[PDB]
Design a protein around this ligand. Structure first.
Ligand SMILES: CN[C@@H]1[C@H](O[C@H]2[C@H](O[C@H]3[C@H](O)[C@@H](O)[C@H](NC(=N)N)[C@@H](O)[C@@H]3NC(=N)N)O[C@@H](C)[C@]2(O)C=O)O[C@@H](CO)[C@H](O)[C@H]1O
Ligand code: FES
Ligand SMILES: [K+]
Ligand SMILES: [Mg+2]
Ligand SMILES: [Mg+2]
Ligand SMILES: [Mg+2]
Ligand SMILES: [Mg+2]
Ligand SMILES: [Mg+2]
Ligand SMILES: [Mg+2]
Ligand SMILES: [Mg+2]
Ligand SMILES: [Mg+2]
Ligand SMILES: [Mg+2]
Ligand SMILES: [Mg+2]
Ligand SMILES: [Mg+2]
Ligand SMILES: [Mg+2]
Ligand SMILES: [Mg+2]
Ligand SMILES: [Mg+2]
Ligand SMILES: [Mg+2]
Ligand SMILES: [Mg+2]
Lengths: 23, 72, 97, 137, 128, 122, 74, 86, 48
RNA sequence: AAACUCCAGUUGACACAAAAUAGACUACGAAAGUGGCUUUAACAUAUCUGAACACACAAUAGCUAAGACCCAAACUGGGAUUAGAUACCCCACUAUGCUUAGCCCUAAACCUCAACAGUUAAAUCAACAAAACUGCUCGCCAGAACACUACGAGCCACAGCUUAAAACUCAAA
C-alpha cells in the first residue's frame, strides 16, 4: 500500500494551518 | 485392549527383560505375554483384586523357571 | 458379536508428566543459597527458564524472591555470594568452554 | 591444587601469593577505554596514585587517540612510571568498550608489568539517565 | 458498621468457640482481618433482615444486596482516592446494574421491591 | 493479618540488641499486634553497604518477628522503624505461610501452533 | 527405487510394461509427439506406489484420468 | 558502588595467558548480554523501536530453532545412495 | 480443627510478661532458612 | 572546528529523575495503558445487544499556576558542510518531559479486521493479507476532488476540537 491519499491531506492541512497563522 | 493395563505395570516393575523379541515369528510369546496369560487364567478362578492377582502371577512364573529381575 | 474388538480406554502406557526440580517446594526470599543457584556468578543476572529448566510458575517465584531479597539486605545484586559458589550446579550454562 | 578463575575472597585465607603479597595488596591498573581516548591510572591498594597516562599525554590528537596504537603507547608509559616505584603485579579494572580496551593491556605487558586478573567495571545502569538521541549518520 | 470484635462468618458457627481464650477470639474477629471479611457480615445481616430465604443467594433479592455492599465499598474507596478512575467506573456500572435489577424486580414482585428499597435505603427513580 | 518483619539491626552487644528487640516488640503490642515468635537468623555481613542514620554499616543482625496485627498497624509501624537509630533496615511482608501452594501435576507439553497460515500455494 | 528392479522384472515376466523411472512430462498427455501419431497408450495403469519421492501424488495419477485410463493403486 | 570490589566480572590469569582471560571475560559478558546492552544504551532506543527489535529477534530465534531442528533430523539421510542405478 | 490447633499455639505466643525471657532465648539460638537443591530434586540441607 | 580547562582519573559521601537481567514469559485492565520493592484498598453484571452529543474515561504534545531539576531536548546561539543549507553531523542551553491542582479531548487511539452465539459440511475462496461461512443486533458507507475545508451550533477549548455541505471542475480516481 502507498500513502498517496495521505499526502494530499498532509499538504491540505499544512496549507490551512499556515494561512490561519498569517491571518 | 484389557491386557494393556497389565503390560504397562509389568514393564514399569520389571521392564523389557534380557530375552529379545522375534517379531518375524508370528507365534512368539514374550515373557510379559506369558505373565498376562497366567494373570488372566487366575482371574477366571474368581479373584477380584489386581494387587493380589498381580503378586500371585509373579510367583507362578518364578516356580516355572522364569527370571523376573526387578528394576532394583 | 466379536470379543477381540478394542475398547475405549485412556492410554495406560502414558508416562507421568515431568516436573521441575522445585516442584512441591516452597521458595522463600530468605533462602539465598537456593536463589543464588539461578543467577550468574560474575554479573548476578537472573537466568531464564531455558537455562534454569524451571516452570513458568516457579521461575517467577525465584525472580520475585530474588528482587525482594536484594532490596531487603539479604542477597547481592552485582555478583553471586562466593559462599554459594561450591553448591550443586543445576543450570545448563557453561562459560569457560 | 587446581586453578579457579574466581578471585580469592579476602576474608577466607588462601595460599595464592605474588611476591609475598595477597590479592588485596596488589596495585590496580584502572583503564578507561573511551570511544575517542583511553586513560590509564595505576594506584595502590590504599588508593595512592602511582602513574597516569593517556593517549593525549603521549602526543596524540583528535582521531589518533581512538586507536589501538595510542592505547598501547599509553600503557607502556604508565608501566614505566610504576615500575620505578616497585610495581610488578597489577589488577586490571577496565571500564569501557573502546578501541584501547585490550591494546592498553598489551602495553602494560610491554612495560614489565604482570597481569594477575582482569576486572570489568563498565557503567551499566538499571535504567537511570536517558542517553542522547540516535543520530542519522 | 459491625463492631471489630465480631467473629468471622465461618468461625461463629463452629461449636465451642464461645468458651475460649480472649486472644483466640481476637484473632478470629474482624480486627485481624481485611475489609472483605467485614463486607461478608454486612451482606449476611441484610439477608436475614430482608429476604425470606437467606440460604438462596442466586435470587434477584440477594444479588441486589450483594451489589449494594460493593457500591458502598467503592464509595469508601473514592472518598480517599478521588483520582482513581478505575474504581469510579466500577461504581457507576454497579449503580446501573442495580437499577436494572430493581426494574426487573419491580415488574415481577412489587412486594419485595418495597422491602428491599426500605431495607437498603434506595430511592428508586425513573429514567429521563 | 499475619505479617513477617524482616529486621536488620545494627551490630551491637547483647545488652543493647535485646533492648532494641524489646523496644521494637513493645511498639507492635502498642499498635494492637499479637506477636507469635522471634527468630534469630544470626549476625552476618551485609550484601552491600547500607547507609542509615548518618552511618555506613557493613555488618548487622537479622531478626524475624512473626505476628498478627490489623491492616492499619503496618503504616504506623513502618514509620516507627524509620526513626529508630539501631534499626538499619526493616520491612513488613505478608507471611509466606498464609499462602497455600496449589499442587502441581507437572509440565504440560505445548504442541507447535497449527493453522496459522492458509493452505494455499504461495 | 528400492523396488524398481523387482517391478521391471515382473513386467517382463508377465509380458507387460513398466515405468519406474522419472516421469517426463507428456508421456500420456503428449504421446503423439513423443512416440508417434499411431501410438497406443496403456489400457490399465497399476500403481504400486502412488506417491513420488517428495511425498506427493504421482503425476500419472492425474494424467491417466485426463486420458480416461483406469488406474489400480496401492 | 556499595558492593564489594573485585568479585563481579573478574577473571584470574593462568600462567600469564592474559589473552585467554580476556577472551573468557568477553565471553561471559556476551552470554549474559552486557555487551549488546552497552551498545544499545549509547543512544536512546525509543519504545516503539525497541518493541520492533524484540519482535524481530524473537521471530528469528523461532525460525532458526526450527530450521536447525530440521537440519539435525534430515542429516541422517546424507549418506550414500543405497539404490545407485535405480 | 483449625481452632483447636490455634488454641494450643497461642500459649507459646510472646506476651509482655515473658517478653524479656524470649528475647534472650532468641539471642542464643539461630534459625537457618538456607537449603540448596540438586538436579535430581533433592534438598541439600547445610551441615551446620 | 568550536566548546570547557576550579578540567580529567581514582576513592568516598550523596536524588521530588528513570526503573539492566528475568521476559525464549505472554499476564492484568474497558480501552488508553501497565514490567524496581513493600503494604493497604481493590478489579461491575447469573440472557444478549444498546449513544460523535447522556454519563464516565482517554498515549504524546500543549495551555494556566506553584514547586523540583540528574539526564535528554523543539526553539535559539555557536562550529562545520554546501552552489546555497533557515537541514542532516558537533557543542551548549531553554520551554517541555517529573510532582501537585485544574484544563485540553487529539493519534497510523491500526491486531485498519464491531458485540453476542455458533459451525467446519457444502458451491473452498476474484487478488493480496491473518481460511471460509451462518444467525442476531447496533453503528457506518454509496465516483474522485473541493473537504480533517466554509457556514451554523456547542464546548473552561479563542492560531482550538467535535459535527459537517455546496458551487465551479474532471471522465476518471
Ligand atoms: C482512456 N483515456 C485516458 C485518459 O484520457 C483523457 C484525459 O483526461 C484528462 C482531462 O482532459 C483533463 O482536463 C484533466 N485535468 C485536470 N486538471 N482535471 C486530466 O486529469 C484528465 N486525465 C485523467 N483523468 N487521467 O485527456 C482527455 C482528453 C482524455 O483523453 C479524455 O478521454 O487519460 C489520459 C492520461 O491523462 C490517458 O492517456 C488516456 O488513455
Ligand atoms: S512443575 Fe509443578 S511447580 Fe514447576
Ligand atoms: K496497526
Ligand atoms: Mg490539496
Ligand atoms: Mg528495574
Ligand atoms: Mg450493553
Ligand atoms: Mg447515533
Ligand atoms: Mg471522537
Ligand atoms: Mg489526554
Ligand atoms: Mg504536561
Ligand atoms: Mg544537558
Ligand atoms: Mg547553524
Ligand atoms: Mg529544564
Ligand atoms: Mg496503540
Ligand atoms: Mg458495539
Ligand atoms: Mg464523494
Ligand atoms: Mg485532525
Ligand atoms: Mg474545523
Ligand atoms: Mg465556525
Amino acid at each position: 500500500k502507498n500513502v498517496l491519499k495521505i499526502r494530499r491531506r498532509k499538504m491540505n492541512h499544512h496549507k490551512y494551518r499556515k494561512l490561519v497563522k498569517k491571518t | 485392549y484389557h491386557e494393556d493395563r497389565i503390560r504397562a505395570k509389568f514393564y514399569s516393575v520389571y521392564g523389557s527383560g534380557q530375552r529379545a523379541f522375534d517379531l518375524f515369528n508370528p507365534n512368539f510369546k514374550s515373557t510379559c505375554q506369558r505373565f498376562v496369560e497366567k494373570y488372566t487364567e487366575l482371574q477366571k478362578l474368581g479373584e477380584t483384586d489386581e494387587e493380589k492377582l498381580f503378586v500371585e502371577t509373579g510367583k507362578a512364573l518364578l516356580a516355572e523357571g522364569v527370571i523376573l529381575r526387578r528394576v532394583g | 458379536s466379536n470379543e477381540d474388538l478394542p475398547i475405549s480406554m485412556e492410554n495406560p502406557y502414558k508416562e507421568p508428566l515431568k516436573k521441575c526440580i522445585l516442584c512441591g517446594k516452597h521458595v522463600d526470599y530468605k533462602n539465598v543459597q537456593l536463589l543464588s543457584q539461578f543467577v550468574s556468578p560474575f554479573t548476578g543476572c537472573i537466568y531464564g527458564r531455558h537455562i534454569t529448566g524451571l516452570c513458568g510458575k516457579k521461575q517467577k517465584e525465584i525472580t520475585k524472591a530474588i528482587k525482594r531479597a536484594q532490596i531487603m539486605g539479604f542477597m547481592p545484586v552485582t555478583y553471586k555470594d562466593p559462599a554459594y559458589l561450591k553448591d550443586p550446579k543445576v543450570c545448563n550454562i557453561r562459560y569457560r568452554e | 591444587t587446581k586453578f579457579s578463575i574466581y578471585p580469592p575472597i579476602p576474608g577466607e585465607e588462601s595460599s595464592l601469593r605474588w611476591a609475598g603479597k595477597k590479592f588485596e595488596e596488589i596495585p590496580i591498573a584502572h583503564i578507561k577505554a573511551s570511544h575517542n581516548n583511553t586513560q590509564i591510572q595505576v594506584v595502590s591498594a590504599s588508593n595512592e596514585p602511582l602513574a597516569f597516562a593517556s593517549c593525549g599525554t603521549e602526543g596524540f590528537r583528535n582521531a589518533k587517540k581512538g586507536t589501538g596504537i595510542a592505547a598501547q603507547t599509553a600503557g607502556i608509559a604508565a608501566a614505566a612510571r610504576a615500575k620505578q616505584k616497585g610495581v610488578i603485579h597489577i589488577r586490571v579494572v577496565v571500564k569501557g568498550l573502546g578501541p584501547g580496551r585490550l591494546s592498553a593491556m598489551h602495553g602494560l605487558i610491554m612495560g614489565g608489568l604482570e597481569v594477575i586478573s582482569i576486572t570489568d567495571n563498565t557503567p551499566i545502569p538499571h535504567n537511570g539517565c536517558r542517553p542522547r538521541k540516535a543520530r542519522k549518520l | 458498621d459491625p463492631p471489630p470484635s465480631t467473629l468471622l462468618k465461618d468461625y461463629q458457627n463452629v461449636p465451642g468457640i464461645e468458651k475460649v481464650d480472649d486472644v483466640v477470639k481476637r484473632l478470629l474477629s474482624l480486627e485481624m482481618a481485611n475489609k472483605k471479611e467485614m463486607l461478608k457480615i454486612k451482606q449476611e445481616q441484610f439477608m436475614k433482615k430482608i429476604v425470606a430465604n437467606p440460604e438462596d443467594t442466586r435470587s434477584l433479592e440477594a444479588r441486589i444486596i450483594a451489589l449494594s455492599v460493593k457500591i458502598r465499598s467503592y464509595e469508601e474507596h473514592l472518598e480517599k482516592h478521588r483520582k482513581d478512575k478505575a474504581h469510579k467506573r466500577y461504581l457507576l456500572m454497579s449503580i446501573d446494574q442495580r437499577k436494572k435489577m430493581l426494574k426487573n424486580l419491580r415488574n415481577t414482585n412489587y412486594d419485595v421491591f418495597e422491602k428491599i428499597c426500605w431495607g437498603l435505603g434506595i430511592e428508586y427513580t425513573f429514567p429521563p | 493479618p499475619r505479617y513477617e518483619l524482616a529486621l536488620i539491626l545494627k551490630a551491637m552487644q547483647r545488652p543493647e540488641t535485646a533492648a532494641t528487640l524489646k523496644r521494637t516488640i513493645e511498639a507492635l503490642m502498642d499498635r494492637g499486634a499479637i506477636v507469635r515468635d522471634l527468630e534469630n537468623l544470626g549476625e552476618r555481613a551485609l550484601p552491600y553497604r547500607i547507609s542509615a542514620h548518618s552511618q555506613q554499616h557493613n555488618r548487622g543482625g537479622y531478626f524475624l518477628v512473626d505476628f498478627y496485627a490489623p491492616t492499619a498497624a503496618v503504616e504506623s509501624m513502618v514509620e516507627h522503624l524509620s526513626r529508630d537509630i539501631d534499626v538499619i533496615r526493616g520491612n513488613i511482608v505478608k507471611h509466606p505461610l498464609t499462602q497455600e501452594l496449589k499442587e502441581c501435576e507437572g509440565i504440560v507439553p505445548v504442541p507447535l501452533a497449527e493453522k496459522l497460515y492458509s493452505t494455499k500455494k504461495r | 527405487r528400492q523396488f524398481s528392479y523387482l517391478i521391471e522384472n515382473m513386467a517382463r515376466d508377465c509380458g507387460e510394461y513398466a515405468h519406474t523411472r522419472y516421469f517426463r512430462g507428456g508421456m500420456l498427455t503428449n504421446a503423439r509427439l513423443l512416440f508417434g501419431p499411431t501410438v497406443r497408450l496403456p489400457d490399465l495403469i497399476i500403481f504400486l506406489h502412488t506417491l513420488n519421492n517428495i511425498f506427493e501424488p504421482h503425476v500419472a495419477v492425474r494424467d491417466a484420468a485426463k486420458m480416461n485410463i483406469p488406474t489400480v493403486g496401492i | 558502588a556499595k558492593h564489594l570490589k573485585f568479585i563481579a566480572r573478574t577473571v584470574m590469569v593462568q600462567e600469564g595467558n592474559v589473552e585467554s582471560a580476556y577472551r573468557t571475560l568477553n565471553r561471559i559478558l556476551t552470554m549474559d548480554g552486557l555487551i549488546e546492552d552497552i551498545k544499545h544504551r549509547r543512544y536512546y532506543e525509543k519504545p516503539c523501536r525497541r518493541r520492533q527489535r524484540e519482535s524481530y529477534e524473537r521471530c528469528r530465534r523461532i525460525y532458526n530453532m526450527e530450521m536447525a531442528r530440521k537440519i539435525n533430523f534430515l542429516m541422517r539421510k546424507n549418506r550414500a545412495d543405497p539404490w545407485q542405478g535405480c | 480443627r483449625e481452632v483447636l490447633q490455634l488454641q494450643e499455639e497461642v500459649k507459646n505466643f510472646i506476651t509482655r510478661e515473658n517478653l524479656e525471657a524470649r528475647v534472650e532465648a532468641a539471642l542464643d539460638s539461630r534459625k537457618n532458612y538456607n537449603w540448596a537443591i540438586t538436579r535430581e530434586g533433592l534438598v541439600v540441607r547445610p551441615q551446620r
